[PDB]
Design an enzyme around this catalytic site. Sequence first.
Site, mmCIF file in Angstrom:
data_model
loop_
_atom_site.group_PDB
_atom_site.id
_atom_site.type_symbol
_atom_site.label_atom_id
_atom_site.label_comp_id
_atom_site.label_asym_id
_atom_site.label_seq_id
_atom_site.Cartn_x
_atom_site.Cartn_y
_atom_site.Cartn_z
ATOM 1 N N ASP A 143 59.706 71.857 8.419
ATOM 2 C CA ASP A 143 59.295 71.070 9.664
ATOM 3 C C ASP A 143 59.056 69.468 9.229
ATOM 4 O O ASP A 143 58.489 69.436 8.109
ATOM 5 C CB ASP A 143 57.746 71.200 10.324
ATOM 6 C CG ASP A 143 58.227 72.642 11.354
ATOM 7 O OD1 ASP A 143 59.046 73.167 11.121
ATOM 8 O OD2 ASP A 143 57.042 73.152 11.739
ATOM 9 N N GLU A 190 50.721 67.416 14.978
ATOM 10 C CA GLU A 190 51.751 67.705 14.387
ATOM 11 C C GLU A 190 51.714 67.115 13.001
ATOM 12 O O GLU A 190 52.151 67.926 11.922
ATOM 13 C CB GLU A 190 53.288 67.642 15.023
ATOM 14 C CG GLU A 190 53.463 68.585 16.144
ATOM 15 C CD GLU A 190 53.576 69.837 15.824
ATOM 16 O OE1 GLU A 190 53.636 70.257 14.626
ATOM 17 O OE2 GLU A 190 53.446 70.940 16.728
ATOM 18 N N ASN A 223 57.745 76.646 6.652
ATOM 19 C CA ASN A 223 57.560 77.950 7.365
ATOM 20 C C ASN A 223 57.738 79.039 6.412
ATOM 21 O O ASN A 223 58.574 79.144 5.600
ATOM 22 C CB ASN A 223 58.086 77.697 8.706
ATOM 23 C CG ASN A 223 57.847 76.525 9.327
ATOM 24 O OD1 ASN A 223 56.788 76.001 9.574
ATOM 25 N ND2 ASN A 223 59.012 75.683 9.668
ATOM 26 N N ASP A 272 59.615 81.722 7.364
ATOM 27 C CA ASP A 272 60.761 81.965 7.305
ATOM 28 C C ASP A 272 61.986 81.262 6.598
ATOM 29 O O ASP A 272 63.083 81.262 6.631
ATOM 30 C CB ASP A 272 61.273 82.061 9.127
ATOM 31 C CG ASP A 272 61.347 80.512 9.552
ATOM 32 O OD1 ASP A 272 61.218 79.589 8.686
ATOM 33 O OD2 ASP A 272 62.046 80.406 10.809
ATOM 34 N N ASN A 292 62.152 71.245 13.092
ATOM 35 C CA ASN A 292 62.329 72.293 12.284
ATOM 36 C C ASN A 292 63.898 72.427 11.851
ATOM 37 O O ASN A 292 64.925 72.223 12.439
ATOM 38 C CB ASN A 292 61.928 73.757 12.552
ATOM 39 C CG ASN A 292 62.803 74.372 13.339
ATOM 40 O OD1 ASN A 292 63.680 74.909 13.312
ATOM 41 N ND2 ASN A 292 62.144 74.622 14.928
ATOM 42 N N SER A 331 62.138 77.916 6.697
ATOM 43 C CA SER A 331 62.621 76.545 7.263
ATOM 44 C C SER A 331 61.363 75.739 6.939
ATOM 45 O O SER A 331 60.396 75.922 6.359
ATOM 46 C CB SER A 331 62.919 76.556 8.663
ATOM 47 O OG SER A 331 61.775 77.272 9.544
#
Length: 129
Positions: A52, A35, A46, A48, A59, A50
């Site tokens: 992380d 990650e 991301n 959308d 997120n 959002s």
Amino acid sequence: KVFGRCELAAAMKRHGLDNYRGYSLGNWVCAAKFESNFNTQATNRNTDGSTDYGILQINSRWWCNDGRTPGSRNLCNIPCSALLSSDITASVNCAKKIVSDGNGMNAWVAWRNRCKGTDVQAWIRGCRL
Ligand SMILES: Nc1ncnc2c1ncn2[C@@H]1O[C@H](COP(=O)(O)OP(=O)(O)OP(=O)(O)O)[C@@H](O)[C@H]1O
Ligand SMILES: Nc1ncnc2c1ncn2[C@@H]1O[C@H](COP(=O)(O)OP(=O)(O)OP(=O)(O)O)[C@@H](O)[C@H]1O
Ligand SMILES: Nc1ncnc2c1ncn2[C@@H]1O[C@H](COP(=O)(O)OP(=O)(O)OP(=O)(O)O)[C@@H](O)[C@H]1O
């Protein structure tokens, strides 16, 4: 902070992740490796809208507040910036909520695609914890 492998294993164990919800320590170390490459400061946006955050790439649509994510739920009740600290406590506490939520560690795409079903114990080999 960029953790070493065994350094992070030991910190995760101190913070109660070893076998948390039945996921052995190597699963958590493997997830963090893929990650964030063990970097607490990692951030990635991301599609959308959002983002992380942190060593486990938590997120901002569901788990933390970053002030810029429509429909944020902030289920960990924390600013996303807290997930970037050298102290992994906030990330660990939020990850415990995530992994308890129904899908287990499948919430982490890198875990699903790169750790699940593999020899995850290798990630703690040689470590003095
Ligand atoms: N006496 C205290 N006063 C304030 N906070 C405390 C105290 N004891 C524990 N905590 C809280 O515990 C949280 C995590 O525990 P702690 O700091 O002891 O971990 P640690 O063993 O040092 O971690 P690591 O192995 O990653 O270095 C810290 O964020 C701190 O907020
Ligand atoms: N973003 C996600 N967050 C949480 N859980 C997820 C996420 N994506 C997939 N999962 C869950 O992880 C597990 C495996 O995901 P995956 O998409 O590969 O499975 P699937 O579509 O149900 O089918 P199959 O695994 O048989 O190919 C399933 O339980 C899926 O619901
Ligand atoms: N099978 C399910 N049915 C309904 N709600 C679910 C289910 N699994 C998880 N949830 C809830 O959906 C929200 C997102 O959970 P999830 O584990 O999918 O998060 P995530 O992996 O970070 O996000 P995403 O799936 O968007 O990538 C949380 O509130 C979780 O409790």
